[model samples]
Target chain A: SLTPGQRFREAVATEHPLQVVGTINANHALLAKRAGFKAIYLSGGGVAAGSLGLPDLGISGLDDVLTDVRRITDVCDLPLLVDVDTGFGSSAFNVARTVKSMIKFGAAAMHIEDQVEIVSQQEMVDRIKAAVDARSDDSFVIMARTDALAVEGLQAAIDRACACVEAGADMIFPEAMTELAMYKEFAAAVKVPVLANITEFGATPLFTTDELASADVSLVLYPLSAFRAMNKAAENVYTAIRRDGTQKNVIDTMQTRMELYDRIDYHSFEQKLDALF
Target chain B: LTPGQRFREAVATEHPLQVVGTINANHALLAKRAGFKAIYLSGGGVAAGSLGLPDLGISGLDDVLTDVRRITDVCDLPLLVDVDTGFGSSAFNVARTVKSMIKFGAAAMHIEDQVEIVSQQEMVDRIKAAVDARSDDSFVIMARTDALAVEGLQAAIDRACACVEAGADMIFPEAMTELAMYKEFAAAVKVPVLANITEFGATPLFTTDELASADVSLVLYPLSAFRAMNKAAENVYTAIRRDGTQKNVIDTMQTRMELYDRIDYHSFEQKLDALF
Candidate 1:
């Protein structure tokens, strides 16, 4: 009965809360589960860049994200928080379909953003409103993200966040806030919960959990943290193979077969057969 | 472009035609791409058995044929197909979905009378209508009877003989229990003979020579070669993992360079590079 909005609200209540590390592949989800995380995140950026081997530049479609959603859900049972970037289009009806499909595929919560390059704010607002209205399951939360700070400056982004709160966003994500004061200004302006994006090699400084918490940020999404780690790991393996003429040296960093078995819970599958039989 | 209907016509053009090997998640189009010569028999019994699972019907419609039409369109090859006991339901819709599947690129299809659930003969007229529903491109409506050994040899023969009269292109005498049983039925039957000489079944493993001697014109080995080949391949992988360095096992395995060539993957990347 828990809606996605309720899950976000509950996470806010927890102290030094679950960061919800994002993963692109099922194997990465396995790694996150092994790392003792209760929640995992799927990003459109991760899907585009990591999974499909392309840039995070909006080339990936609903089908692309849906495939990753199904694959990740196929292996892991942990609650998934997905980034439904800009809800992928203009139509409110499309957003409703998108939200319903994601919820059906075991997404606990999803954030719809308002970062329109060619589309209007009114159109995007209508989509978020329609998504919240069309939520079939109570546990399905609709988080709205305002990318206005980088485009129309901090005040405009804050006003957009407040408007989304009025529209029916359970939480808000303020995109591209490089300075800590910008986070404070946005958090103070809005009464609702906010998520801080602490991405690597980005304009935003790598603020600790305390810095983000001090800014009244309810959630800190390291969306590509695990993926960035994975990419580096895979790159190291490839480089090692090229340099050493074998993967023997890199096998230590690679997750072991027994470790993978424990992470995938192979024994639980056997237990299921025992119980069923 | 040769649409599926025309591809069916190509099959009739040859005798003792080669129905090459293929195993895609969707079996329809791959059969055509491999040059569809006959009904693409889904190696289901072998597929399940080799997976260390019983063929007690664990595979589903969702399991085997994800999108029949997708494969059908790829080759547009008329399939003299394998429906594997009509996948439940009574005669009408089973026959209807079968007939519609032909419209989905199944030119000629053989429907097995062995329903996974209750063995029922309460609907002969329903099956007759099913077989009569549609058949084009010389679409052969073959009826397979596994009832022979189960319900005495006489009952099996009678059911198969009745199926031919009711509209079957060929009669498949399943689990003959003995070769002489086939000789008895083949002499009486008014159509082509099909022998299910599958490896490791209730029936004895008979070679094409013995089957030919039995007056069986159409012989379906189904999964004979695949079972042998899969086991041979599986052993190599198992051995390689048990001992480091596939030193002795290298000769048995498919070469990495050969594998790349077989997939035609490099050509695909080259085409993309050339175009872009």
Candidate 2:
């Protein structure tokens, strides 16, 4: 099997407007893969909300996300792209550790965003350089996601994107772009694949894949779309069970046991058991 | 505020209460909402669900700790985790498992008496070392003896007594065939007894009230809910694949709105902004 980084690079090259869906766990990754998704993402917010039950204010650590990464990568072969919020902390070593550890945990690529504090462009460049230098595998993408469009303005965001590219960033994710033209600007300025954060409830409109592709956006990330849908589905299950006394009524809402076995390959586990014992 | 301390107190008070298994944060919240004061983390379930491996001594301290931390981080329930064969037969391995689990927010844990490809004498040594290695005296250790069906009731009872003498806070008599066997073990062990009331096992399903009558303190339904959830998840996965959308099974899923409330999604972002 190819490394997640290698598979990720391949996906970015072949697929236009690649939809990188977020998965909270390994099971979700399997579902996304079976749903015809080429790459999967592990959002920092998803980890905080889905796994740790904490708000996404950077409370979760590398180990927390790493736990999910290890589990997800172990079970699913889809190249994983993780969200390392502001490189976990501001230190150069922290950035280096975050980059190296994510790769070690089998992440194919990651987007280190400029969300926590509005650091100097030079400092952000240094962090990008540190992240790029830390990873020995070149195929492992070190994408720089600038929240600059929200904080520093469009022109400054383009400047930061270009600076990160000069510092060896493989991709650029300009968060909270107000229009399609902003993606075009970042994609043109950075000379690399640009990602559009098409999350719901955000300022950006839900631009179609054609619009994003036309704007030179290589990847359109619906970071929490599946998660939102899943949450809705789970709430229904809980409420129905409370009302119905038995899950039989809500049984139609669940993925069947046979399907789960097919996805997780439960039969192979039994075969492994027989072989090992 | 220590969860381990809280778990110790609950086990001391609840009269043979049910401790169901929860594999994730969502399940932990559901179990808590259902008024369960205590919950379980099964090693077998973790291996199967989390690591996608068999329960045959494949998962380690990290795999078990991952599930423990995930559940404990979200839910405040006193979690009793299963550390299979102490993760190894050595004293050092046992000590690592104990200290790590306590730090991971587990209130209690049960180390099995199975040899795990080793001898029974070595198993006794592991239990002794585990008891001695715990940093917190309040951290409960329930020594589980699978000897009931293997070595007979008398040997199982003797083993349980020996574990108690080694400073075990509780007793878990595994694979008990009769209610009388439980009574004998509880009578001799002289500590809180745990009955493994798992489904589809060699042990017959004994109700909470019945186990309480036999002096059981914790009636562990380790995999009951997990089994149900897996069957549920399996069905959901199958339907989504076949149907191309979750439209038909949306009702079976916990809603996005409900999930946010359960996981406190709204507070996470606000507090995150505030904290930073």
Candidate 3:
């Protein structure tokens, strides 16, 4: 069997502008796979909200995200692209540990976003190089995510992404871009797979699959669409039960026991016992 | 006692302590904010809600402890954990399980009589082993007996009495068909007795005031919030899959600001500022 990283590379090659749905829990991960997504995403912000109940301020760490990724990957085989928040800290060793642990815990690819303490651009590139060497598997992906576009100007962003690619980043993620054309120059210049952040309620407008693929973006990320809806539904549920003293009013909105078991393939698991004996 | 007996204090202060099950750290915080003084972590909940696995005793210590630490770190509410058969086939395993539970800041755990992995003698030995292993005497060793339906009331009472002698700090008569059974369990055990009021189980959702009259020390509502959360997740997942975009279901979600407030992101911000 191939590693999750190998599977993820194949997924990227197989689909143009691969659509990754954000999944918050193990059950939601399985649900996303069943919804015809070839890959799933675990957002750092989603982890803070759905699992940790905190906001995305980097209070959650490697161990916290590792717990979610392990449980999600334990039940589902879809390639997972994880957000390694601020490389877990501004050090090479911390970046390396995050890289190694993500692969061991069955994540397919991980993106290290830009941030550091009074650091030079080369220091940022070195973290990518450090992460690239840390992965035991060649198929495992190291994605460089740069927010330099809004801060340092377009030329600096492209140059920094190129530097990261020069240091062995398999993919480039240009964050918080308002222009669709931003991806075109990035893809052409970097000559690697470029991902565009298509998250709603952000600086980036909601782009359709056709619109994003038109710009040569290889991945379109809807980072918190499902999570926002899940939170809303939970809010309604908690409110209904607390007010009415019974879930009778909201019972129809729930997934039946039959549906949950069917999605998880409970019978297939039981068949393993029969076949083993 | 090391001041670790928050579970006992909650039980003492709140008549018929309301122990609601928290599926994750966020749920624990929600339960605490909703005025719940105590919380619960079910073995089946860790399997189903957290791991997406069936609740047939497949989860392990690390699985449960991960949530335990996650919840206890964020919420100060004392948590009661479910340790089915002490997670293994021997007394030393129970000792290790109980020690880890305390180390992770869980205040109590219930080991079921489904240690049919048991004779009565082995069950008591496991209880004694768990009690002796705890570094803090304030930590609770609750023995839950599933023997009521099989052997009838008198036998279950006898079993409860024996467990108290074996050093069980509490007793949970799991899924009793009647409220009357709680009074009997408490009278016989002569310790803090609990009634599992999980919905759709053999037990009914009796109120805290009702259970208080029956002399039940604790009323456990395990998996209520988790069921609501799973159902909510299901509705959202289905809606988005059908609608292409989640726009139609936007109002059904808790707004981003509400989630931020519940998690106290501002407090997290002030801490970093203070540190710098």
Top candidate, metric DockQ? 3
Cα error, residue A220 of model 3, in Å, equals 2.2
Model 2's CAPRI class? incorrect
Error of 2 at A63 (Å): 3.9
Each candidate's chain B TM-score? 0.71, 0.91, 0.95
Using Cα atoms, each model's DockQ against the true complex is 0.02, 0.19, 0.37
Q: Which residue pairs overlap in candidate 1's backbone? A: A2-A139, A3-A138, A3-A139, A4-A139, A4-A140, A4-A141, A5-A141, B4-B76, B29-B71, B39-B80
CAPRI docking class of candidate 3: acceptable
The pairs that clash in candidate 3 are A231-B254, A232-B252, A232-B253, A232-B254
Give the lDDT ranking, best first: 3, 2, 1
Question: Model 2: runs farther than 4 Å from truth?
Answer: A1-3, A30-36, A117-126, A148-163, A177-191, A198-217, A222-277, B1-4, B24-30, B66-76, B116-125, B148-167, B175-191, B195-216, B223-276
Q: TM-score of every model?
A: 0.52, 0.77, 0.90
Q: What is the TM-score of chain B in candidate 1?
A: 0.71
Each candidate's number of clashing pairs is: 10, 31, 4
After superposing candidate 1 on the true structure, give the runs of residues whose Cα lies further than 4 Å from its correct spot.
Answer: A1-9, A15-17, A117-120, B1-276
Candidate models: Cα lDDT each: 0.66, 0.75, 0.79
| Candidate 1 per-residue C-alpha lDDT over A111-209 given as tens digits, one digit per residue, 9 for 90 to 100 | 887665424566556766778776866656678877788778888787777777887787788888888777877888897778888888988899888
